[PDB]
Design a protein around this ligand. Structure first.
Ligand SMILES: CC(=C/C=C/C(C)=C/C(=O)O)/C=C1\CCCc2ccc(C)cc21
Ligand SMILES: CC(=C/C=C/C(C)=C/C(=O)O)/C=C1\CCCc2ccc(C)cc21
Lengths: 214, 11, 214, 11
């Protein structure tokens, strides 16, 4: 109820017109500020109590950002495009020691997004579903977050079948990339904690805050 | 706790 | 094409009529043998090359087993029912040091399965979707595994909307538990590797083999 | 490698 994909698309269009690891971390911190502005544009998100807004963003920021730079890289050959305007090529990541996770992003996310031609509206809805994660611990009202998630995938399904009537299994295909996004998001976080532990690789203030407890 | 995030969401 | 939910249900019905950790591991090894027999009953699974069958089971055995004991525990108060016939209560897990992951299973899987009354047919299809994981590394023909997955959720969606016409969002609700299953499966595996590392907690031959490389 | 699993799938 009251979750038009038009508003979701606007949010997407509104927030985005030597060591690759350092560049990636720098791009993440930068995008964390934009993520907040993006979320505020997601219908009903700002109507939730501040505490729940913090919990949802802290719980999904990594998956939310991975989804964004992955879709942005659909045109890129073998690499990803950072929000900073730089490109991280597959070989560069490998030469930096993060080849394993990098290839998972290309194979499980980027490549798949390109093969099915995932559009910005679909991207937005998937990110909105992730944002409204009812399983996030500490939620004062998980039921309300649950209702909002259902409204999103309900509007997403409507969008599909209508925009792509020829592809009846598109809606399910979109949601079935979430498990891979969940797995890749966890691995990327593991690397970040290790980078912070080792000391190398500069980590900015907002990214650092996201690594804080819990 | 979560100083930056709270401030940004509030404005 | 040729993936009737009837065959999937039969597979489910065919395979299932002091330290809780040791009991859990023992139940896992036991169920690993049954998992194989279950998979063989999944349409077209046995038609894949032996190498791909091994890759799919090694990639999803943990999520496949977690889904099964979770659904089996829908009636259980605050705990889970092991295939061995024993019950592991929430407090017992906590007193064993695995309270954090145990509560995630109850809150994110068991509780949700019970709230939406997930039936055996739905369980079967979800497990079949997990089994047919096209993202599994080493697959000789990921395309074929991809096609089979689509046939399953295509038959699953048909089952829903027809069995539960009043719940148009049931199909999406079912698939949206996969991300949680993916996350919980990874954590459970982490614990197993730690248990093996520490030496304590006896680990049987088949479970041990699943912990082997890759 | 994967001795047990292969044998079970083969039978
Ligand atoms: C958590 C994270 C955030 C990325 C934010 C970016 C780069 C956003 C953007 O530029 O749009 C990704 C990491 C976090 C650090 C490690 C890492 C390694 C490989 C890859 C493909 C990603 C990552
Ligand atoms: C990987 C795994 C397999 C379980 C198999 C069982 C117990 C199957 C069955 O009895 O049906 C689960 C583990 C693996 C060991 C650690 C663990 C801790 C808590 C919980 C809820 C589960 C687990």
């Amino acid at each position: 109820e009251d979750m038009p994909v038009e508003r979701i698309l606007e949010a997407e269009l509104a927030v985005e017109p030597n060591d690759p690891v350092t560049n990636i971390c720098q791009a993440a911190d930068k995008q964390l500020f934009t993520l907040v502005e993006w979320a505020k544009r997601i219908p009903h998100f700002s109507e939730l109590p501040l505490d729940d807004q913090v919990i949802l963003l802290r719980a999904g920021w990594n998956e939310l950002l991975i989804a964004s730079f992955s879709h942005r890289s659909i045109a890129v050959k073998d690499g990803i495009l950072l929000a900073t305007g730089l490109h991280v090529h597959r070989n560069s990541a490998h030469s930096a020691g993060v080849g394993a996770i990098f290839d998972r992003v290309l194979t499980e996310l980027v490549s798949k997004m390109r093969d099915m031609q995932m559009d910005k509206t679909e991207l937005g809805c998937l990110r909105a579903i992730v944002l409204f994660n009812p399983d996030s611990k500490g939620l004062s009202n998980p039921a309300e977050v649950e209702a909002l998630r259902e409204k999103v995938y309900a509007s997403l399904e409507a969008y599909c079948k209508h925009k792509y009537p020829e592809q009846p299994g598109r809606f399910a295909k979109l949601l079935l990339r979430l498990p891979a996004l969940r797995s890749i998001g966890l691995k990327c976080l593991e690397h970040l904690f290790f980078f912070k532990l080792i000391g190398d690789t500069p980590i900015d203030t907002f990214l650092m805050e996201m690594l804080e407890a819990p | 706790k979560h100083k930056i995030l709270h401030r940004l969401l509030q404005d």
